[model samples]
Target: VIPEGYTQENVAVRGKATQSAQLRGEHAANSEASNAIDGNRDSNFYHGSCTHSSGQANPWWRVDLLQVYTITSVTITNRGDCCGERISGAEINIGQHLASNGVNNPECSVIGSMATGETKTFHCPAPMIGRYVVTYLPTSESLHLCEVEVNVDKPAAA
Candidate 1:
C-alpha cells in the first residue's frame, strides 16, 4: 500500500540498472539488467522481457535512482517460464552507498516462495531514504527478474 502524499509512480523506470552478471552465449538474448526496468511486467521470460544473471554466488541486481528519495515499497515479478524458486529468499535493499553493490545496504524485506509469474509487493516497515534499490539473492544460483518497480513518496511541489 502507498503512504499518504506518495503517488504510485514507479521511479525505477527512470533509473539506471546493472546486475552482477548477465547470461551470455546462446539463450542469452534479452537478458539484460535494464529489462527489469523496461516498464513491462510481462512475466514470460521467453517473450524477451526478463533479466537473467549468470550462475554465481550472491547474485544481485541494482537500480540507481540518481537521487535520494523516500522509498516506500518495491514490487517484483518473478520469471514465469521456469525456475521461479530461484527468487526465493531474495533480499530487497535500499541505500545511498554502493558498498557490495548495495547488497550491504539496509535490508527492507526478504522474499519467500513466489509461484511462477507471481508479482508481489514488499512494503518497507518505514519509509527508506536511498538512491539505490537492489534485489540480492544470497545463494549460488541464477537470478531472474521479470520486472521490478520502486515506489517513492511524491516530490513536493516547488
Candidate 2:
C-alpha cells in the first residue's frame, strides 16, 4: 500500500480480463479474470478461485487499466494451495496491441521457477506506457493468477 504522498500507485485497480476457459460450474467459480484485482490475495479466494486455462500454447492473463499508464513494475502472486511452480517461466509483457496473444509484446521478465505462496515483482526495463499488462506462459501449459498488480507512476497531481 502506498502512503498518502507516495508517487507510485497500483493502477490495475480499474479492472482485468483473461483468456481463461469459459465460465461454467467449477470453472465459473473461478472464471472471472477480474478476481485477480479484487484486492484480495487470500489463497482460498484468489488462489483457489483463480482464473485457470490449459490445452493452449502460451495461455495468458491480462489486466486492462482502461487508460494508458507509465508502468514501472508488475507483481505476480502464485497460488498458495499448490502448484506455484505452474506460474514459473511466465512472461511479463507490456504493450498496446493484443498482438500474438500478448506474447509478442515487449518482454518485461520471465518468471523462473517461482515457489508456492511466493510473490515476485519484475521491473520493466524502462517505464513503459500501455493499457494492458499481460502475463503469459509460453508453452502448452496452464496459467493461473492469484493476483496481478500494476505499479505505475503517480498522477501529476500528487
Candidate 3:
C-alpha cells in the first residue's frame, strides 16, 4: 500500500484497462485476454489456465510510464490461488517493450522474468530509464495481478 499522500485511489489506479484485458476462469487453462489489436498477429494469448508450458512467450501486462522516475522495485499481488491452493510455477516479466501494439511502428523490449510464489526484487544493475513499467502474466493459474506496486525515490541531490 502506498502512502496516502503520494498515491490516492485515483493516482494509484489510473485506469480500469478492460479494453486490453483477457478475463478468465480459475482453471480454464485456455482462457486468454490481450491488448493486441491484430487478430492474426497472435500477439497476446491467455496463460492463466495453462496446465503446462513454461513462459510460452505470451500474455503480458504493460505500463506506459507517463513520465520519468527512478524505479526501485516492482511487486505483483494476486488473489493467491483461492485459499492456499498453491500458486506454483508463476513467472513475471519486467521490461521496456513487454507491451507493444505490434503495428507498423511498434516499439518495446521483452526482458526479465521472476518465478512463481516469489516476489523477486533487484536493483537492475542498469537503471530502467525509459517509458514503461510492464509485467507479463503467467499461465499457471497462480500468477495474476490484483494489485501492482512500483517503488521509486523522489529526486534528492545530483
Candidate 4:
C-alpha cells in the first residue's frame, strides 16, 4: 500500500477532471473504455490519462524525501474500477531520479507504451532516494490508478 503521506492531497497536481477525462483525455462518452473502482487495494484506481502519446511529457507521482532509502517495488492498482475502465501500463516506472551523496544521480524508471483496463505493477532492482518520486502520465489514454505502493526491502540481520 502507498505510505500515509503520498497522494494528490499531499502533492501539488494541477488540473482536475472527471476520472474518465483524466484517464482518457479524449473519449466518446459511454466509451467501452469506461471502468470503475471500489475500495479495493489490489488494483490501480483511475489515476489519470495514459502516456503522452501526444508528445507531451508525462507527470509522475512525486515523493519528497530528504534522505536515501531502498525501494523494493511499486504496486499500481488499475481496475479499482467502478464506472470507468481500468488503466493499462500500471506496471511501469518513469522519470526516476536518485541522489545518494546529495549530488545529481537520476535513476531510470520502467515505462509502458500501451493502455489497459487492468491492474499493473512494477518491481525495482534496488532502492534509492531523491527529492522527488514521479510516476508518468505522458500521453492521453486510460489513466486510473487506485494505488501506488512503494515497497522498501528491509535488510536482513547479519
How many collisions per candidate? Answer: 0, 0, 7, 43
Best by lDDT: 1
- In candidate 2, which residue pairs clash? none
Per-residue CA lDDT of model 1 for 1-158, tens digit only, reads 65556457789998999999998878689799999999999988888889999887889999999898788899999999889899988999999888788989998899977999999999988889999999999988799999999987674455
TM-score of each: 0.93, 0.83, 0.43, 0.43
Candidate 3 residue lDDT tens string, 4-105: 335312112332222134444553354332221111222122333212113333445444545544454545433333312223333333344434531111
Tens-digit lDDT track of model 2 for 1-158: 34365577778778667664533565566656776787766654334546666546667888778887778888877777776767778889888877776667888778887788677788888888788888888776667777788898664473
Q: All candidates' lDDT scores?
A: 0.89, 0.73, 0.35, 0.36
Ranking by lDDT: 1, 2, 4, 3
For model 3, the stretches where C-alpha displacement exceeds 4 angstroms are 1-20, 24-57, 81-123, 138-143, 155-158
lDDT of 4 by residue, 83-118 (tens): 233233322332234332212244434545323344
Give per-model CA RMSD.
2.0, 3.2, 10.2, 9.8
How far off is residue 92 in model 4, in Å?
Answer: 5.3
Off by over 4 Å in 4: 1-57, 65-67, 82-108, 111-120, 155-158
TM-score winner: 1
- Candidate 1's C-alpha runs over 4 A off are 3-6, 155-158
